[PDB]
RNA sequence: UAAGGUGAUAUGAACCGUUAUAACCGGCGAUUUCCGAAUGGGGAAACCCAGUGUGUUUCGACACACUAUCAUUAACUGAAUCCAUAGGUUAAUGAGGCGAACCGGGGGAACUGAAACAUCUAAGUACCCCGAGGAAAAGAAAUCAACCGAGAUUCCCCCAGUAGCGGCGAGCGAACGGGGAGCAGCCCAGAGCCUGAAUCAGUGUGUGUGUUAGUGGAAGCGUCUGGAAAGGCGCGCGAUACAGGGUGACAGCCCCGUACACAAAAAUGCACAUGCUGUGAGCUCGAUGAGUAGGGCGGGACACGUGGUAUCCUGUCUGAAUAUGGGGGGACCAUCCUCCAAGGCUAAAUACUCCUGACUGACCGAUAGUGAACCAGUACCGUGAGGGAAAGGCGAAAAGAAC
RNA sequence: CGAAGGUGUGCUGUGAGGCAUGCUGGAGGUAUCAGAAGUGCGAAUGCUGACAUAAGUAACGAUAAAGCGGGUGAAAAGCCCGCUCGCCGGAAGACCAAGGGUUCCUGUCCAACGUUAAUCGGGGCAGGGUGAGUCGACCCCUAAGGCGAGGCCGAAAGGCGUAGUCGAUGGGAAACAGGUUAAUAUUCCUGUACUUGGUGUUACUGCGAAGGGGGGACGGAGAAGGCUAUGUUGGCCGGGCG
RNA sequence: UACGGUGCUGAAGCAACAAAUGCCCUGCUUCCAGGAAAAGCCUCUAAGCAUCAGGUAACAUCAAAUCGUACCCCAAACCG
């Protein structure tokens, strides 16, 4: 009964990237998602001789709260909250605006 | 006759060591880590079947586990059993 | 154990009271005696550690009545 | 000087060990107190 | 494999159980050295021995 | 139930899964080493050593089952000793051990108070011991009352700090009666007559109601400040949902929930219903609990310390009547009233919380609150019983500082 | 657009106090009028924590003793190697039991630990190491003693004890020499033995116990005699001619 | 020659004397204070067994498990 899932396209509601969009890359068990290309941090990656990493300032994506994102409704061009209904005996997601089934 | 199911659970691992390399080339003796409740007859029956090699004698000893400290928490490794298995002459094993 | 087998008497506890009413705890032992009772039906003697009150009971009820009670109580004799 | 603790494992286990506690009634009450307190080492016995 | 092994006899499960345990031995000596580089096979065989041992107690004595 | 998983420190590795046996949750199962009542014998717990039987053997040996003690019953056996009995051997069933408090019983202090102290008090308290149940205990008048009557037991409020008890000191302290909670009565001491008739127990089934996973669950944007908006200022919207929590600062409308609406393949509680098994129901005529009541002596219990002391219990010695009879009505007697001991059973109101769920607090906020917010009954101390700590907070996010 | 708290300043009240504000702090605080208190600390040889003081003072644990060269190293009085010196030698050497439990060996590290430094260590970290038919235990046997079916006794708990069953510190089969590992050896290897059980043939034929007997099986002191361990000297062999 | 070592080769290997608190000796002598137990081991028969079982004798074969074994141990490792 998770509203935001893996291949979903979301928009960001709060934080330093209020308004940007992206695809969720993975959702974490702690109630966080990593959305592709948004919450960028610059990690000072320490070199390891074994494992062959040269070590640099790697810029990568940090997790963000699921509460901070909503599924982008590409029809209206906005964010919509997600409801659940049963269609053909199968639980599907739909947008709370305009009642259209999320696919 | 030792049952065939138990003989697969007797042997744990070969033990690599400087002493193990010496005993293999001089006295022609392999060094095995065995199960703790395994006796000498169970090891001799297992090596003669699972490795297909002729065992002359098996000497065993129990290795007491060391006491280590991970961080600041004390801990103790497991007691394990060690077997010097002397193969008969001409026999060879990897 | 100081227990009459017939009547079930038992050492109870009380007080020695002095003239100045000083109370020290004492015991009241029952007047137990081991006695061989002739059972006429079974034609043998049965020893019972019995008080003198219980010997008055055996003289009144009869040894057959009392040994019925001791088996119904579940007591060896 | 000769101090008051002269150890002997045989005498340690016959006097304070597990089966010496379980033998008598009061020793069984000792193990019930240590379980109620929640001791890691319930007796002397290794 | 609970559906597949259930459609076997007592002697076939006993044959299969003896073939799993040889594989468990052969993985363990391989993992004793640094040769085994698929660590999940130790868990898969160990789970599959448990499925065979489960069905033997069902078909026999139950 | 699911798109994500392979518990935590704790990354990584190798993998699994994405429409359904990946994982996860619940029900019933399976496995369940060794020690421990430990139960085959032993033992310095987690070890040592067997016996018997049925199986396997590549004859080297393996695997499995059983074997404690006691009680009861049954079978068989069986002395001195003829029968017999004791004893013996099997078999079956049961018990054993643990656990916080509450309960009943067997034992039972002292410090203390008395401004000392011995009677007394503390107090049938602490403690020890035994036994039991979800409650136990008590319980269906040989009870009160006062010439009117009440109608088993237990509990609460009164009566009343009264009447009394007491080195008449310190203290101890009712009952009758009244108001409530709760209410229920029965059976054997025995025969018949009618025969399965009441009720209860056990075991099924069926139905309802729970419990043990779950499902749906409303409605917000703009702008300003700011690292970040849930804040400010606008403008809306939901509400049988403004309980609560989380989200980068304070969110009804972002998230999780909440109100409300539902949901169980399987197991199970409780109700009913009913089947079966066992149990007797009703009527009549009887019968009506003896080493007992009472007494002497010594103690104990009753608020009642032997006092003028009734009543209750019994260690000891005695010892009735027995319904035309007996017990009680606070020495005792008479009259009158009331009741029927020496056989039993019984729900409710009552007591408690190791434990589970939900919620609450003019309760605490890390020297507090549990000893313990943290790998705490740990470290440590002690031969041992036993004693017993200290120690919370980077940030919104490790972006935990490449070079 | 900066709460509590912290730290200043200014002002104000008769006092306990109050108000405003700078800085720090970075998220709570709370008028008024009522209500309730774990409501105010300098003392209790108070309790807990932190920090002073004496004071960079006493001391640095046997008066068996050191000196130098070389090495390693960031650094050497202390480590390693070498040559001298000194000390023990019925121990300050060697082997165990008891007890401890990895302190053993090797690599690596020097923060803490070591009464100084430390490259060193019984310190940290990682790896390695304990091999048995004969050693020891287990086991067979019992002592003192413990437990103890029944039993006897006791308010309960329990006490004592028979048959039994435990319990060594004593009784009971057998392995030595040489070699070897960084670390084990009567355990490994080489050589040469030994003991007790199984089964199996062959010859032989009174076997049989929970019973009977023998043996095991026993003190103190003293006296010699015979030896050996071991030592000294000679011989012998090898080296030496200062 | 990793200066630690490792490999190879190898003479003589006798006698006398002294000599224990060790061994014969669990002896011997002597004294009074009068000096464990049980099994292994040896032997005797009881019921039993009757040409079978068992007994010892030789030979062959098999078995001898399990646990301990490092290190200090008059000490820097044990009790202080
Ligand atoms: Mg060998
Ligand atoms: Mg060994
Ligand atoms: Mg008194
Ligand atoms: Mg992980
Ligand atoms: Mg046992
Ligand atoms: Mg036992
Ligand atoms: Mg035994
Ligand atoms: Mg007193
Ligand atoms: Mg007083
Ligand atoms: Mg009751
Ligand atoms: Mg009337
Ligand atoms: Mg839901
Ligand atoms: Mg919702
Ligand atoms: Mg949010
Ligand atoms: Mg903030
Ligand atoms: Mg009667
Ligand atoms: Mg009557
Ligand atoms: Mg009376
Ligand atoms: Mg009377
Ligand atoms: Mg009287
Ligand atoms: Mg009297
Ligand atoms: Mg009387
Ligand atoms: Mg009655
Ligand atoms: Mg605290
Ligand atoms: Mg604090
Ligand atoms: Mg504390
Ligand atoms: Mg200790
Ligand atoms: Mg500021
Ligand atoms: Mg506050
Ligand atoms: Mg301030
Ligand atoms: Mg401030
Ligand atoms: Mg807050
Ligand atoms: Mg205060
Ligand atoms: Mg202060
Ligand atoms: Mg003061
Ligand atoms: Mg003070
Ligand atoms: Mg000081
Ligand atoms: Mg100073
Ligand atoms: Mg000075
Ligand atoms: Mg000075
Ligand atoms: Mg000085
Ligand atoms: Mg000095
Ligand atoms: Mg130098
Ligand atoms: Mg020096
Ligand atoms: Mg030197
Ligand atoms: Mg260490
Ligand atoms: Mg060392
Ligand atoms: Mg080192
Ligand atoms: Mg330094
Ligand atoms: Mg230092
Ligand atoms: Mg070290
Ligand atoms: Mg030996
Ligand atoms: Mg004895
Ligand atoms: Mg007994
Ligand atoms: Mg005894
Ligand atoms: Mg014995
Ligand atoms: Mg010994
Ligand atoms: Mg011995
Ligand atoms: Mg050594
Ligand atoms: Mg004899
Ligand atoms: Mg002598
Ligand atoms: Mg000589
Ligand atoms: Mg010269
Ligand atoms: Mg050694
Ligand atoms: Mg020494
Ligand atoms: Mg010393």
mmCIF file of C-alpha atoms (C1' of nucleotides) in Angstrom, chain D residues 5 9-10 12-13 16-22 25 29-30 32-34 36-41 44-46, chain F residues 35-37 43-46 97-100 128-130 371 377-388:
data_model
loop_
_atom_site.group_PDB
_atom_site.id
_atom_site.type_symbol
_atom_site.label_atom_id
_atom_site.label_comp_id
_atom_site.label_asym_id
_atom_site.label_seq_id
_atom_site.Cartn_x
_atom_site.Cartn_y
_atom_site.Cartn_z
ATOM 1 C CA UNK D 5 41.920 -17.476 49.558
ATOM 2 C CA UNK D 9 38.552 -26.052 41.799
ATOM 3 C CA UNK D 10 37.482 -29.375 43.320
ATOM 4 C CA UNK D 12 35.200 -24.761 44.899
ATOM 5 C CA UNK D 13 32.694 -26.958 43.090
ATOM 6 C CA UNK D 16 29.515 -23.789 45.983
ATOM 7 C CA UNK D 17 28.836 -25.581 42.697
ATOM 8 C CA UNK D 18 25.576 -26.258 40.924
ATOM 9 C CA UNK D 19 24.769 -29.747 42.141
ATOM 10 C CA UNK D 20 25.775 -28.840 45.678
ATOM 11 C CA UNK D 21 23.171 -26.086 45.550
ATOM 12 C CA UNK D 22 20.501 -28.300 43.995
ATOM 13 C CA UNK D 25 16.212 -27.248 49.936
ATOM 14 C CA UNK D 29 16.042 -21.308 47.208
ATOM 15 C CA UNK D 30 19.398 -19.665 46.546
ATOM 16 C CA UNK D 32 15.541 -19.193 42.813
ATOM 17 C CA UNK D 33 16.712 -15.887 44.258
ATOM 18 C CA UNK D 34 19.467 -15.485 41.698
ATOM 19 C CA UNK D 36 14.609 -13.715 40.225
ATOM 20 C CA UNK D 37 17.399 -11.155 40.414
ATOM 21 C CA UNK D 38 18.428 -12.241 36.929
ATOM 22 C CA UNK D 39 22.048 -13.271 37.376
ATOM 23 C CA UNK D 40 24.166 -14.062 34.349
ATOM 24 C CA UNK D 41 26.317 -16.550 36.271
ATOM 25 C CA UNK D 44 30.054 -20.851 40.608
ATOM 26 C CA UNK D 45 30.096 -23.697 38.073
ATOM 27 C CA UNK D 46 31.896 -22.935 34.837
ATOM 28 C "C1'" C F 35 22.170 -29.258 30.880
ATOM 29 C "C1'" G F 36 18.173 -28.561 34.087
ATOM 30 C "C1'" A F 37 12.038 -32.038 37.968
ATOM 31 C "C1'" G F 43 28.458 -36.788 38.384
ATOM 32 C "C1'" A F 44 32.641 -31.303 40.203
ATOM 33 C "C1'" A F 45 25.278 -28.771 35.682
ATOM 34 C "C1'" A F 46 25.843 -28.319 30.152
ATOM 35 C "C1'" G F 97 9.426 -29.241 38.891
ATOM 36 C "C1'" C F 98 8.711 -23.784 38.093
ATOM 37 C "C1'" G F 99 6.179 -19.105 38.914
ATOM 38 C "C1'" A F 100 4.960 -12.088 41.061
ATOM 39 C "C1'" C F 128 9.591 -20.436 57.871
ATOM 40 C "C1'" C F 129 6.592 -24.511 56.157
ATOM 41 C "C1'" C F 130 2.335 -27.032 53.593
ATOM 42 C "C1'" G F 371 19.461 -0.317 40.402
ATOM 43 C "C1'" G F 377 21.646 -7.267 37.649
ATOM 44 C "C1'" U F 378 26.423 -5.859 33.307
ATOM 45 C "C1'" A F 379 31.427 -4.133 34.823
ATOM 46 C "C1'" C F 380 33.296 -4.627 39.545
ATOM 47 C "C1'" C F 381 33.607 -6.568 44.852
ATOM 48 C "C1'" G F 382 33.062 -11.065 47.873
ATOM 49 C "C1'" U F 383 35.103 -18.223 49.323
ATOM 50 C "C1'" G F 384 29.986 -17.781 49.541
ATOM 51 C "C1'" A F 385 25.074 -16.187 50.441
ATOM 52 C "C1'" G F 386 25.113 -11.496 48.724
ATOM 53 C "C1'" G F 387 26.400 -6.512 47.157
ATOM 54 C "C1'" G F 388 26.321 -3.494 42.858
#
